[PDB]
Swiss-Prot record, chains A, B:
First-listed, main subcellular location of the protein, grouped into a coarse class: cytoplasm
A Gene Ontology cellular-component term: cytoplasm
Places the protein is found: Cytoplasm
Keywords carried by this UniProt record: Chaperone, Cytoplasm, Plasmid, Virulence
Keyword Ligase set for record: no
Role, per record: Assists the correct folding of nascent IpaB. Once it is bound to IpaB, it binds to IpaC and impedes their premature association that would lead to their degradation in the absence of IpcG.
InterPro entries found in the cross-reference section: T3SS_Ca_resp_chp_LcrH/SycD, T3SS_Ca_resp_chp_LcrH/SycD_sub, TPR-3, TPR-like_helical_dom_sf
GO MF: identical protein binding
Coiled coil location: none
Name assigned to this protein: Chaperone protein IpgC
Pfam family, one: TPR_3
Similarity comment: Belongs to the LcrH/SycD chaperone family.
Origin species: Shigella flexneri
Length: 137, 137
């Protein structure tokens, strides 16, 4: 039988002050270089609240360091759909499409950041990438 | 719309050699004193394979240090139901019921370990607790 029992036996709901504390550790383990450990905290956060741009961006940033570019890119796709005209995710999907050796999709991602973004610093990165592509093709 | 896309986009299934590596970190963070960080790795493992005695015992051991005794005890309940006559979980449910200041339930847990367990070392702990209860009531 096993059953489950006279129980409780949750209540998986996690308090918000703890959901945030989890993010904090996810960031720390990221910064402090310990990647595979931070991939958990993120994969966890996404399992709970998947429509959070901050959590998706985190996870995607990890699949990108782990060099699993296809996955990181599909995630950035969503981070940008939840993206109220935030073009950061599109820039990185550019970096990814580049390492996936498909530079036509890559060129479009950067061209697109330049045309619609209001992040003056990001437009600079994105333009700088375009320039560096045609500089030794 | 958002959609999800041309994707994959898992595939949450985690390789077994990684599920084990996650346990390993959960233990390390536990031993190395960093509790709240280990509570995640465990809460994660239970989210995946909840019918694992090792994972449940881990999480319960953490709720018990975090002094959330009621939750720790409900988990031990299950760790023992999956428990092929392993009475360790019942011993701790005794420690918990004690801090929940309900010493009648506590006395029964220990008496029960004494009567059915084959862990000679455990039977000594369980008996010593009983003796220490009536020694200054």
């Amino acid at each position: 039988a096993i059953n489950s029992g006279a129980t409780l036996k949750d209540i998986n709901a996690i308090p918000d002050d703890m959901m945030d504390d989890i993010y904090s550790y996810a960031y720390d383990f990221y910064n402090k270089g310990r990647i595979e450990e931070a991939e958990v905290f993120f994969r966890f956060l996404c399992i709970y609240d998947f429509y959070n741009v901050d959590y998706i961006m985190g996870l995607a940033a990890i699949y990108q360091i782990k060099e699993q570019f296809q996955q990181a890119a599909d995630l950035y796709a969503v981070a940008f759909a939840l993206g109220k005209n935030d073009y950061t995710p599109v820039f990185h999907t550019g970096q990814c499409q580049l390492r996936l050796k498909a530079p036509l999709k890559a060129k479009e991602c950067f061209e697109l950041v330049i045309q619609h973004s209001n992040d003056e610093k990001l437009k600079i990165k994105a333009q700088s990438y375009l320039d560096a592509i045609q500089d030794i093709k």
